[PDB]
Amino acid sequence: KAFPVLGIDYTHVRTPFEISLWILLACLMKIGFHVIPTISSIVPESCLLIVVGLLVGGLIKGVGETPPFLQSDVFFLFLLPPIILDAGYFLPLRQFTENLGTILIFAVVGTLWNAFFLGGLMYAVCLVGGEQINNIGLLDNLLFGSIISAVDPVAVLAVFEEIHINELLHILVFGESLLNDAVTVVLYHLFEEFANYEHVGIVDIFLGFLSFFVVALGGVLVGVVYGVIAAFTSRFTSHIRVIEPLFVFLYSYMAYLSAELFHLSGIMALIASGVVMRPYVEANISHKSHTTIKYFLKMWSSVSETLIFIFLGVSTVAGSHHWNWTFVISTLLFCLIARVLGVLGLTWFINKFRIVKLTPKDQFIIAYGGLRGAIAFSLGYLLDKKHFPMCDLFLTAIITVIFFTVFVQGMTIRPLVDLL
Amino acid sequence: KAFPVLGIDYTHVRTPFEISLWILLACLMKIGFHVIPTISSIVPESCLLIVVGLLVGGLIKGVGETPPFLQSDVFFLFLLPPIILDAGYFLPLRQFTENLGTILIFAVVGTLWNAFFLGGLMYAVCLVGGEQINNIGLLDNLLFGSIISAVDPVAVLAVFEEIHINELLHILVFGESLLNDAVTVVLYHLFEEFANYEHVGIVDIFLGFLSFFVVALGGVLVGVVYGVIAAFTSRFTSHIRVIEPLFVFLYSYMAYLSAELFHLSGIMALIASGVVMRPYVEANISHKSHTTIKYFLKMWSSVSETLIFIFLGVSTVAGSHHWNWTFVISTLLFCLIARVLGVLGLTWFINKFRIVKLTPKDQFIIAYGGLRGAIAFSLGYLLDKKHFPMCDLFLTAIITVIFFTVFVQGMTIRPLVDLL
């Protein structure tokens, strides 16, 4: 062997190199996405992430080598908590606790309505059209309804500006997105656990409801415990001003992992820890350290969302698909109808309770404009084949819903709202 | 199964939870290390990291479960480039290119001298005392000499202050540490490759020398290419001010990985990329983005060094040891003598070339005070057992050298320098 050390060893650096290449491509085309005169306020960033994922998936398909995949743990352990922490750390408490009732009712009850309505009506149409979807079942369909109700409405706010977005609408969609991402994951775990055993009774359903509430609240309690501990430690960190962000991220991640240890709601725990610590930091912390906390949250969340959408593109271009016309058309039309009905009913019921009525403007913004992405795909994609034999059909439906609700309900929300 | 979702599943979150627990313990005891009236300027941070690693190793030994380990790739791919980027990104060019000759000669020639002198003299004493080290060999001993010459003198600067540290001494120890960490890894790969085949000739030695230079310079060239590309892209990133740090880190890491792809010097490539980009960033970048670049470099380097030293503590408490009195005493005394002789000779030879003589002050600071750590241990620890059957003895010697040169040559450097 001439030239002793020199080599061409590529298998050594394949995961880090390709991951860095994907992130670099996404960021490069993101800075190529803002220089365009007016596209930043015409399409959401979600469209850009879809397009980047499509390009990378096309590249991988052209190369022909094995497509990468999330190993059902990298997601829940390293890609979800960044997104959740970026969202929940910048939650404005003054205008959150001011209307916690409305945000809570929308997030929880609207997600439960959307999930159960989609699951039930998808199951009903599965009973109708058969021979490819005839054998779906209920508990296998409520899971699809829950993982397709993981809506992300805050992505649409990049299309609007200071007007058309009240104080109330912004925090409302913020809380909907955040607590919806929590509740959909809790429901995902609940239904995935029920799917195993075929003997489900009234007692089992009651225990499932009880366990839903126990999971959510136990996550919350773990969050408060770790947030209080983080506040106490941040009050003792004047001397070394470089590790303060590291304490914030470490305590949030440990709250998430301690919740996930008991199968409690890690998302709720992380949100609670961030919310509880926020006021108690920024008062004991340098302004530079606060700024770098914000910057690292933004950057790390952007990287996680980018990687998830890259996997979405790889799965949609270089994946197996089970297009069924009835199921896909039914799920699109029924997710839209369920969202609209839920929003209308909930606004009608709460406007009999609040001093400031939710205007039809914001009702339309919430109903038509709630767009999936980056959690719905990931939650549906980690469904194994050992259970849920129609998980390929579930991915096809979820990908179709994501594409339709990001490229149509998100790109054509700004003009229809002027047509009020 | 009552309580459907509730569980106690710990194997799911074991690596992330224990890693976060270690980092939290280290940072907590770091902030407990600065509040002490005067210990920050009495001992280096290296001593604190050794103590944290010892405590965590004792905890793991008490628990009794399997000790974690670096899989020979996590180090070179995720723990080395953080340290190297923190060091080389803050390299002051004005006072680096001003005396590049002296820094370069110290780093390269002094490391080569230290490595070859230690290897040869360790081999000579191995020929003398036997029955446990009688069968070591030369090429198996030059590798130990190289991996024990990975000195980190900048750790001692935390013990001094604005006086006793000239303009020249600071940049000199900085460059020594940085380019020494590069050269020792290049030599590690060279000797690890030679160790395989037992038929080494004059042609092979010449080719090894040639390949050493080719590896170093090819790393440098990859570094300049990626640094120029990073500068060009940073000049086009005014619009989105949140991804600028992400471009910096992405381009540095891609330079490192592209160098490691060809087995070139990844450390040299990363240093070159950072140096080449630095002036061309901070002129096209927001001040906040520059500050967060600095903060993330510091924090991520601190985390990597902490994890490496935690592994050091785990290996020294919960590892297998092959204490040999002659080898250990010989390596301590000979590493000290080699360092002193190399420093004295090189300063004598270059003070006949420079206008500003290197004073005996800084000669003593460099010679006695060059302390190993966080690279020497890791480089020695990734030695397999399939080759190098005495790698246990090599770890024992390296750990002993680290402890002695951090707790003795680093803790008792500040008083002996007053005794000038």
Side-chain angles (χ1 to χ4, degrees):
Chain A
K1 192 203 170 150
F3 299 152
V5 176
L6 272 300
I8 198 75
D9 189 358
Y10 182 76
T11 74
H12 182 204
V13 307
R14 199 184 164 89
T15 318
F17 192 53
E18 285 183 354
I19 291 293
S20 298
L21 200 62
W22 297 347
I23 304 170
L24 174 77
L25 195 148
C27 296
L28 202 67
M29 185 179 288
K30 187 194 295 300
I31 80 182
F33 163 80
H34 279 84
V35 293
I36 301 299
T38 187
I39 294 301
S40 173
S41 292
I42 301 299
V43 308
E45 264 185 339
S46 284
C47 296
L48 179 68
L49 303 186
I50 303 299
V51 165
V52 171
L54 285 184
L55 282 191
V56 162
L59 277 191
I60 293 171
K61 181 75 175 296
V63 175
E65 301 267 320
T66 304
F69 63 104
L70 305 158
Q71 295 98 6
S72 296
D73 291 331
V74 59
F75 173 68
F76 281 88
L77 292 196
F78 312 119
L79 299 186
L80 201 47
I83 310 172
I84 298 315
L85 191 45
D86 170 22
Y89 193 72
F90 308 161
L91 189 76
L93 294 174
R94 205 282 322 287
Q95 65 183 357
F96 191 72
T97 62
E98 182 36 74
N99 54 2
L100 175 58
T102 295
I103 297 169
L104 196 64
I105 190 168
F106 267 97
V108 166
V109 177
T111 296
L112 275 170
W113 180 257
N114 207 317
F116 274 57
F117 188 89
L118 270 173
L121 189 61
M122 281 324 317
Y123 170 78
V125 66
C126 288
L127 284 157
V128 171
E131 281 275 10
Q132 293 264 300
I133 62 170
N134 189 359
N135 313 87
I136 287 292
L138 193 50
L139 276 297
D140 291 331
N141 215 329
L142 258 65
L143 190 151
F144 163 69
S146 70
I147 68 186
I148 193 155
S149 88
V151 68
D152 188 38
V154 297
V156 74
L157 294 174
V159 185
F160 291 135
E161 71 295 71
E162 60 260 51
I163 200 160
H164 312 356
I165 304 292
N166 290 318
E167 175 167 355
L168 172 43
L169 182 49
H170 171 71
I171 188 63
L172 197 64
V173 302
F174 208 101
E176 286 182 359
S177 178
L178 189 59
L179 273 53
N180 176 229
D181 286 357
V183 165
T184 185
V185 161
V186 174
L187 277 183
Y188 167 86
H189 287 159
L190 200 70
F191 290 155
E192 193 179 355
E193 213 285 339
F194 285 172
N196 303 330
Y197 60 91
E198 62 161 48
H199 208 186
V200 65
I202 277 161
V203 172
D204 274 293
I205 299 163
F206 174 59
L207 277 186
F209 160 88
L210 216 52
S211 69
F212 171 93
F213 275 81
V214 175
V215 165
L217 297 179
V220 159
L221 273 295
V222 161
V224 237
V225 164
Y226 276 72
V228 164
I229 283 188
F232 184 65
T233 61
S234 87
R235 170 183 299 178
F236 279 52
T237 305
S238 160
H239 294 89
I240 174 65
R241 295 168 183 171
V242 180
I243 311 302
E244 295 173 351
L246 194 61
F247 292 102
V248 174
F249 293 102
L250 266 184
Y251 273 126
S252 281
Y253 196 47
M254 292 186 69
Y256 179 81
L257 290 183
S258 192
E260 283 292 351
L261 195 145
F262 305 120
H263 286 117
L264 297 182
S265 188
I267 299 92
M268 272 325 295
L270 189 153
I271 290 152
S273 86
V275 162
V276 170
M277 85 181 47
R278 193 171 160 51
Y280 281 65
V281 242
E282 319 190 319
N284 297 115
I285 301 299
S286 171
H287 307 177
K288 288 153 81 57
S289 296
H290 176 211
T291 293
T292 189
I293 284 176
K294 272 177 44 52
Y295 265 69
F296 182 76
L297 282 184
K298 214 52 71 173
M299 182 179 72
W300 178 226
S301 175
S302 176
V303 167
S304 299
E305 281 163 9
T306 294
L307 275 188
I308 293 180
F309 279 111
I310 288 296
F311 279 115
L312 169 54
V314 170
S315 162
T316 184
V317 173
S320 294
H321 289 322
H322 192 205
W323 192 260
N324 197 332
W325 271 108
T326 183
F327 197 99
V328 160
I329 298 313
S330 178
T331 195
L332 286 169
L333 190 150
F334 289 162
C335 71
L336 187 48
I337 280 184
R339 190 92 175 104
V340 173
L341 271 170
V343 165
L344 285 195
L346 290 173
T347 63
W348 176 96
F349 157 70
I350 65 173
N351 281 329
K352 288 186 167 240
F353 272 56
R354 304 185 66 188
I355 295 94
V356 296
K357 315 292 153 266
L358 285 181
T359 61
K361 189 76 170 295
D362 50 281
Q363 294 182 358
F364 175 86
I365 299 304
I366 299 172
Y368 179 96
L371 61 83
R372 281 81 185 170
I375 178 160
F377 154 73
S378 65
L379 278 190
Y381 176 72
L382 309 189
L383 291 191
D384 63 358
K385 186 65 71 69
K386 185 35 72 193
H387 322 94
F388 322 102
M390 296 324 178
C391 65
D392 262 348
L393 190 137
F394 282 175
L395 276 296
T396 301
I398 293 169
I399 289 167
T400 291
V401 160
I402 287 174
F403 271 52
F404 166 87
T405 196
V406 174
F407 281 59
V408 167
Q409 296 186 4
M411 214 153 67
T412 62
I413 189 168
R414 168 151 162 92
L416 300 161
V417 70
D418 297 68
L419 277 69
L420 56 87
Chain B
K1 192 203 170 150
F3 299 152
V5 176
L6 272 300
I8 198 75
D9 189 358
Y10 182 76
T11 74
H12 182 204
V13 307
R14 199 184 164 89
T15 318
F17 192 53
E18 285 183 354
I19 291 292
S20 298
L21 200 62
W22 297 347
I23 304 170
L24 174 77
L25 195 148
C27 297
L28 202 67
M29 185 179 288
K30 187 194 295 300
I31 80 182
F33 163 80
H34 279 84
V35 293
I36 302 299
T38 187
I39 294 301
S40 173
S41 292
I42 301 299
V43 308
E45 264 185 339
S46 284
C47 296
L48 179 68
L49 303 186
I50 303 299
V51 165
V52 171
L54 285 184
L55 282 191
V56 162
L59 277 191
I60 294 171
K61 181 75 175 296
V63 175
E65 301 267 320
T66 304
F69 63 104
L70 305 158
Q71 295 98 6
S72 296
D73 291 331
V74 59
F75 173 68
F76 280 88
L77 292 195
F78 312 119
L79 299 186
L80 201 47
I83 310 172
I84 298 315
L85 191 45
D86 170 22
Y89 193 71
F90 308 161
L91 189 76
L93 294 174
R94 205 282 322 287
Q95 65 183 357
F96 191 72
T97 62
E98 182 36 74
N99 54 2
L100 175 58
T102 295
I103 297 169
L104 196 64
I105 190 168
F106 267 97
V108 166
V109 177
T111 296
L112 275 170
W113 180 257
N114 207 317
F116 274 57
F117 188 89
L118 270 173
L121 189 61
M122 281 324 317
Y123 170 78
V125 66
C126 288
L127 284 157
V128 171
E131 281 275 9
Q132 293 264 300
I133 62 170
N134 189 359
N135 313 87
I136 287 292
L138 193 50
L139 276 297
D140 291 331
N141 215 329
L142 258 65
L143 190 151
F144 163 69
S146 70
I147 68 186
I148 192 155
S149 88
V151 68
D152 188 38
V154 297
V156 74
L157 294 174
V159 185
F160 291 135
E161 71 295 71
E162 60 260 51
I163 200 160
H164 312 356
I165 304 292
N166 290 318
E167 175 167 355
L168 172 43
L169 182 49
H170 171 72
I171 188 63
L172 197 64
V173 302
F174 208 101
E176 286 182 359
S177 178
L178 189 59
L179 273 53
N180 176 229
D181 286 357
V183 165
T184 185
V185 161
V186 174
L187 277 183
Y188 167 86
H189 287 159
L190 200 70
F191 290 155
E192 193 179 355
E193 213 285 339
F194 285 172
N196 303 330
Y197 60 91
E198 62 161 48
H199 208 186
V200 65
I202 277 161
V203 172
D204 274 293
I205 299 163
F206 174 59
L207 277 186
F209 160 88
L210 216 52
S211 69
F212 171 93
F213 275 81
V214 175
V215 165
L217 297 179
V220 159
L221 273 295
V222 161
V224 237
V225 164
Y226 276 72
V228 164
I229 283 188
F232 184 65
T233 61
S234 87
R235 170 183 299 178
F236 279 52
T237 305
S238 160
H239 294 89
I240 174 65
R241 295 168 183 171
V242 180
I243 311 302
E244 295 173 351
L246 194 61
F247 292 102
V248 174
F249 293 102
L250 266 184
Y251 273 126
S252 281
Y253 196 47
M254 292 186 69
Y256 179 81
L257 290 183
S258 192
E260 283 292 351
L261 195 145
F262 305 120
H263 286 117
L264 297 182
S265 188
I267 299 92
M268 272 325 295
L270 189 153
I271 290 152
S273 86
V275 162
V276 170
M277 85 181 47
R278 193 171 160 51
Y280 281 65
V281 242
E282 319 190 319
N284 297 115
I285 301 299
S286 171
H287 307 177
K288 288 153 81 57
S289 296
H290 176 211
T291 293
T292 189
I293 284 176
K294 272 177 44 52
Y295 265 69
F296 182 76
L297 282 184
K298 214 52 71 173
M299 182 179 72
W300 178 226
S301 175
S302 176
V303 167
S304 299
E305 281 163 9
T306 294
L307 275 188
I308 293 180
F309 279 111
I310 288 296
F311 279 115
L312 169 54
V314 170
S315 162
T316 184
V317 173
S320 294
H321 289 322
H322 192 205
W323 192 260
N324 197 332
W325 271 108
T326 183
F327 197 99
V328 160
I329 298 313
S330 178
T331 195
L332 286 169
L333 190 150
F334 289 162
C335 71
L336 187 48
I337 280 184
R339 190 92 175 105
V340 173
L341 270 171
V343 165
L344 285 195
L346 290 173
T347 63
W348 176 96
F349 157 70
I350 65 173
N351 281 329
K352 288 186 167 240
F353 272 56
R354 304 185 66 188
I355 295 94
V356 296
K357 315 292 153 266
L358 285 181
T359 61
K361 189 76 170 295
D362 50 281
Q363 294 182 358
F364 175 86
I365 298 304
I366 299 172
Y368 179 96
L371 61 83
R372 281 81 185 170
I375 178 160
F377 154 73
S378 65
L379 278 190
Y381 176 72
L382 309 189
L383 291 191
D384 63 358
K385 186 65 71 69
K386 185 35 72 193
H387 322 94
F388 322 102
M390 295 324 178
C391 65
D392 262 348
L393 190 137
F394 282 175
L395 276 296
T396 301
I398 293 169
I399 289 167
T400 291
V401 160
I402 287 174
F403 271 52
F404 166 87
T405 196
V406 174
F407 281 59
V408 167
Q409 296 186 4
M411 214 153 67
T412 62
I413 189 168
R414 168 151 162 92
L416 300 161
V417 70
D418 297 68
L419 277 69
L420 55 87

